Design a protein around this ligand. Structure first.
Ligand SMILES: Cc1cc2nc3c(=O)[nH]c(=O)nc-3n(C[C@H](O)[C@H](O)[C@H](O)COP(=O)(O)OP(=O)(O)OC[C@H]3O[C@@H](n4cnc5c(N)ncnc54)[C@H](O)[C@@H]3O)c2cc1C
Ligand SMILES: Cc1cc2nc3c(=O)[nH]c(=O)nc-3n(C[C@H](O)[C@H](O)[C@H](O)COP(=O)(O)OP(=O)(O)OC[C@H]3O[C@@H](n4cnc5c(N)ncnc54)[C@H](O)[C@@H]3O)c2cc1C
Ligand SMILES: CN(C)Cc1c(O)ccc2ccccc12
Ligand SMILES: CN(C)Cc1c(O)ccc2ccccc12
Ligand SMILES: [Ca+2]
Ligand SMILES: [Ca+2]
Lengths: 588, 588
């Protein structure tokens, strides 16, 4: 068991030093390495439950059992004196640089997961390359280093959400005594996009700087894995070459889908285009009902836009549907129109985008409702948010032997290993995992530590909290009510729930009994909290802390024992008492 | 052990029914009681670890061991047939109404704790009276039912905080693209106060309604405890009478202190006056450095006011002082002036308050700095926030035998019992407890359940989270860093910490590396989180959920295993890695 771990660690680490805290010769080694600007991992055996068993199995690799012991890419390099020997003779540089491969790690994809993995690996001496390339959208939109969330995802989405929330801050400001003429207030799309894009630009730059400062090689090149250790790269000039790496991390993410209907690629846009759009979308149709669809519809409406969402069947499939309905009801009551049970048949162009006055074009959308009536309506912008897909045939030679699933995602073990043992996948292309930026980051960093610093900790993908940044935000952690019932049976599920009203909404004259929270609990497991759900402002701030408690196995009694902070929305989780089975109303 | 609990429960409950779920005759009893509008507690013995031992000891009270068993104020009333007997003969009303006392419970004080205790008790059949009276402030300010937080505390304070935050929403709105002429925007104090007061009024009314609907008697009368069971009440007409109750709850709270200097009572105001002030305070001096002082200074400054805080020694004594300094630095950088190491000697009047144009007066404040230089400056309003004190000589005849401490607070056991065994104290007058509205509520409700429904659960006063609603909010749960070090020693404490920047602040051009969080952990107890501290927006929403985890014994590893929600401020608690001892900078 310990020999398995040590065999893997030694084989994989780029530059690793086994050591103890109470060891001067070790410090001498650390100092020479620091002095020489040689990064490495370090495992202090005097701080492990079985450090002394480890010290013994080490002699199966070194033929000695003392510390320090220094390894490079699978080979015992020496004790203290052999390290100093190499140094003094200035042979240490060529030694810690000897490898069969150009790199210890090549990351294909410069997004949330891949950048986090790359940096963390370089920390421990892994010679690292990060490849990133942004295939243009059909209208030619491209962007810089950082991935989907930085450039066309969580970051611009939340900032445009914020611009929409400020709309309601302006309305509220009057009731709290601020004098402002709200009829001479308008929103300027292009000013907002410019501020958003200037922040993204600072992130593109910040990442490039971070990579340089960790001695990671950044290649703005499309990578293609041609064999287990060989990556072919095409640069801006279309020049092709080949680099080699020991470990490979696939972190290439996904791109938006279009529906296969006439006009969709030619005249519609996706989220990829929305967040840098050089004209105001104007009267907009969003096709879809994902969290992307609803978030985009929501902020466009709060910015004053005429907004319609075309929904084929239900809102937020895969989420708790009681909550999804409440999310949708709030939106419909606040200016989002819904074309329900409706699908698009074709987009026709009525006006071309004015690339020189920054005005939208004009489109005719034809579709049909389930009741057979035709949908026909003009929109200035049509946004598709009908899901996302991986692009791996563009990255993976089928001959390498990386197994994909039905949907084109990478089939992985619980340590992110593909069917090719030196090749790993993180982020959105890892089949079956929550598609979220902090998951991708935790995966990539924890993987890098296992590869290059002998760590064993795996990423825990269970009970991963989410927030949907709709106009009224929805945060959740754990199971939907319907999934809990399906799993355990209705008789074993108790649901506590309440409406609430943010104090901020009182003077502002906003709604009673719209915000809402519930805990879905398991009767037979001490009222274990199986899922937490909250609809209200700052729902991501509310939910995050409870995710720690849920990971620790929180019960209803743990919530009750805890004292609220007053006045907050979150404190209502500490006094819930109405159950659903009681029939008593949750209104307050 | 079980006989102790049962003896107390039977003696104390007003109307209680022992029962089992699987008992038709019990349901028959419940139905007759429901039919008759007779409220009562109920203990289903088939749902207790020792319900069957309880069923036996019951015969020491009833001479029977079967369910149902119904008690009223210490006396076995009967089995099913004796209950029905009393009903059919319409003797049940006079039976469940027989008592040596007018009331099963008299609550002296209609605040957070007392109202919560009163309602909860009435639920189980306790005939309850709630007394509340609001002694006017020196300028004559008074208010309605609900206590300090509702009327002159947490509620108006947070709403005026919100009015100040909206100031920064207006500034931010421009950078997110909203066109608004910020130089023709001003704030109107009186409009704000009117909205705030209309909400408080709805709470005053809502409480009166809640009390009526739970058959609680509300007396707007000053109560004085003259013997263990006798309360003397003085009404608006100054008419004096005496009511009697079995249990007494003292929940009379505190009032602001004034410094003993000339002019203070005559010309200054406190928070009691601030939240209904009929004129704008204008150029304001806040004397004090409590969380009250800083919160008030902060929103007055965000409303555009010229604001000065006079500070005798340190900010936020009793709070983590690193955090207090960061709170104070943010305020000084955002328009609050601080007269440091300074105390007031006298207030002189220069202009009388214009009661008919709603304008402030004008005051000359004289004081002195520790360096001997004189302080002399004119202010339109001077606000004292130099602490609060109980008023119990106004409530407690010294002959009753309720022990007070040095500061005039009530000395209580951990079940809130005073030295007079039927008299309990909750809320701010309970010596040694956190002075917070949700503590008072949890205390009062859990006490009511122990008195009148045989519950045993005590209120847990440890690791009670707080938030200070300064312009940059500060949330905390558990120990300050200095208190952890003092308790466990510096070598046993590790502190993880980071700056962070709300995404909302980026486009808005606000500060990097001002918001800040830290976890204070114990090395020798598995890096147990001893205190959590966060400075940033929505800090109360951030902190609340983590208080559940801390109550459950969260470690640093529980935080790390948990996946962030992105983008939020709170997710930074899930990736902390820089320790203080490492000397590495927390900036990001
Ligand atoms: C509108 C939208 C909003 C979202 N909001 C949130 C949110 O609020 N919170 C949250 O947690 N998650 C959110 N997400 C999801 C989040 O963006 C993803 O989970 C995350 O960005 C995926 O990280 P990744 O490492 O898997 O891939 P990505 O971030 O997509 O990075 C993959 C990189 O590799 C590039 N690439 C692809 N192929 C190659 C190749 N052959 N060679 C070189 N480079 C290549 C890609 O162009 C890209 O730059 C949102 C997503 C969308 C679409
Ligand atoms: C400016 C300020 C801001 C605050 N902000 C917060 C916050 O944000 N969050 C938080 O949790 N806490 C906050 N607090 C504290 C909170 O208000 C108290 O902890 C809480 O209100 C105390 O509840 P209580 O039941 O002990 O007494 P109280 O709420 O003060 O109620 C006591 C009632 O009894 C009345 N009374 C007194 N004597 C008699 C008598 N003889 N007969 C009849 N009635 C009598 C009193 O007039 C009063 O109505 C704040 C306090 C202040 C002063
Ligand atoms: C129809 N059903 C009640 C759920 C629902 C809403 O409540 C609100 C908006 C919707 C839009 C599309 C589909 C369903 C929606
Ligand atoms: C002086 N010391 C550094 C702490 C401190 C601040 O940082 C900022 C404002 C203050 C006001 C009064 C007392 C102390 C204060
Ligand atoms: Ca509670
Ligand atoms: Ca984490």
């Amino acid at each position: 068991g310990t020999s398995q771990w040590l065999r893997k660690t030694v084989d994989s680490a780029a530059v690793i030093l086994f050591s103890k805290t109470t060891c001067p010769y070790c410090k001498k080694v650390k100092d020479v390495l620091a002095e020489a600007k040689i990064k490495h991992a370090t495992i202090e055996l005097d701080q492990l439950s079985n450090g002394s068993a480890i010290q013994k199995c080490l002699a199966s690799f070194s033929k000695i059992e003392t510390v320090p012991q220094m390894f490079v890419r699978g080979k015992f390099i020496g004790d203290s004196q052999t390290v100093l020997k190499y140094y003094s003779n200035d042979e240490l540089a060529g030694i810690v640089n000897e490898s069969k491969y150009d790199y210890d790690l090549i990351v294909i994809g410069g997004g949330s997961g891949g950048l986090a993995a790359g940096k963390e690996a370089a920390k421990y001496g892994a010679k690292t390359a990060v490849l990133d390339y942004v295939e243009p959208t059909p209208i030619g939109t491209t962007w810089g280093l950082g991935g989907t969330c930085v450039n066309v995802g969580c970051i611009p989405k939340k900032l445009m959400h914020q611009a929409g929330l400020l709309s309601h801050a302006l309305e509220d400001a009057e009731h709290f005594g601020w004098s402002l003429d709200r009829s001479k207030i308008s929103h300027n799309w292009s000013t907002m996009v410019e501020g958003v894009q200037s922040h993204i630009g600072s992130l593109n730059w910040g990442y490039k700087v971070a990579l340089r400062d960790n001695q990671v090689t950044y290649l703005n090149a499309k990578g293609r894995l041609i064999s287990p250790h060989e990556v072919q790269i095409t640069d801006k000039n279309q020049k092709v070459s080949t680099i080699t790496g020991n470990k490979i991390i696939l972190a290439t993410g996904e791109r938006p889908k279009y529906p296969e209907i006439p006009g969709a690629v030619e005249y519609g846009i996706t989220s990829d285009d929305l967040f840098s759009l050089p004209y105001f979308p104007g009267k907009t149709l969003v096709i879809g009902a994902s969290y992307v669809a609803l978030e985009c519809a929501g902020f466009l409406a709060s910015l004053g836009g005429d907004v319609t969402v075309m929904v084929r069947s239900i809102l937020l499939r895969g989420f708790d549907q009681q909550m999804a309905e409440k999310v949708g009801d709030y939106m419909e009551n606040h200016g989002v129109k819904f074309a329900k049970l409706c699908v698009p048949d074709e987009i026709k162009q009525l006006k071309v985008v004015d690339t020189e006055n920054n005005k939208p074009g004009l489109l005719l959308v034809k579709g049909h409702y389930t009741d057979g009536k035709k949908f026909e309506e003009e929109f200035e912008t049509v946004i598709f948010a009908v899901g996302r897909e991986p692009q791996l045939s563009k990255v993976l030679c089928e001959t390498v032997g990386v197994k994909l699933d039905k949907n084109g995602r990478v089939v992985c073990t619980d340590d992110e290993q593909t069917t090719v043992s030196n090749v790993y996948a993180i982020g959105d292309i890892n089949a079956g995992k929550p598609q979220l930026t902090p998951v991708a980051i935790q995966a990539g960093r924890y993987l890098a530590r296992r590869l290059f610093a002998g760590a064993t900790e795996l990423t825990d993908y269970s009970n991963v909290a989410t927030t949907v940044f709709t106009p009224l935000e929805y945060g959740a952690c754990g199971l939907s009510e319907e999934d809990a019932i399906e799993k355990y049976g209705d008789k074993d599920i108790e649901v506590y729930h309440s409406n609430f009203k943010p104090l901020e909404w009182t003077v502002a004259h906003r709604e009673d009994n719209v915000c809402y929270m519930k805990l879905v609990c398991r009767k037979s497991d001490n009222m274990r909290v199986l899922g937490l759900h909250v609809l209200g402002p700052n729902a991501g701030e509310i939910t995050q802390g409870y995710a720690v408690a849920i990971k620790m196995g929180a019960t209803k009694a743990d919530f009750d024992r805890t004292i609220g902070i007053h006045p907050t929305c979150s404190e209502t989780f500490t006094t819930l008492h109405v159950t659903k089975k009681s029939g008593v109303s949750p209104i307050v």
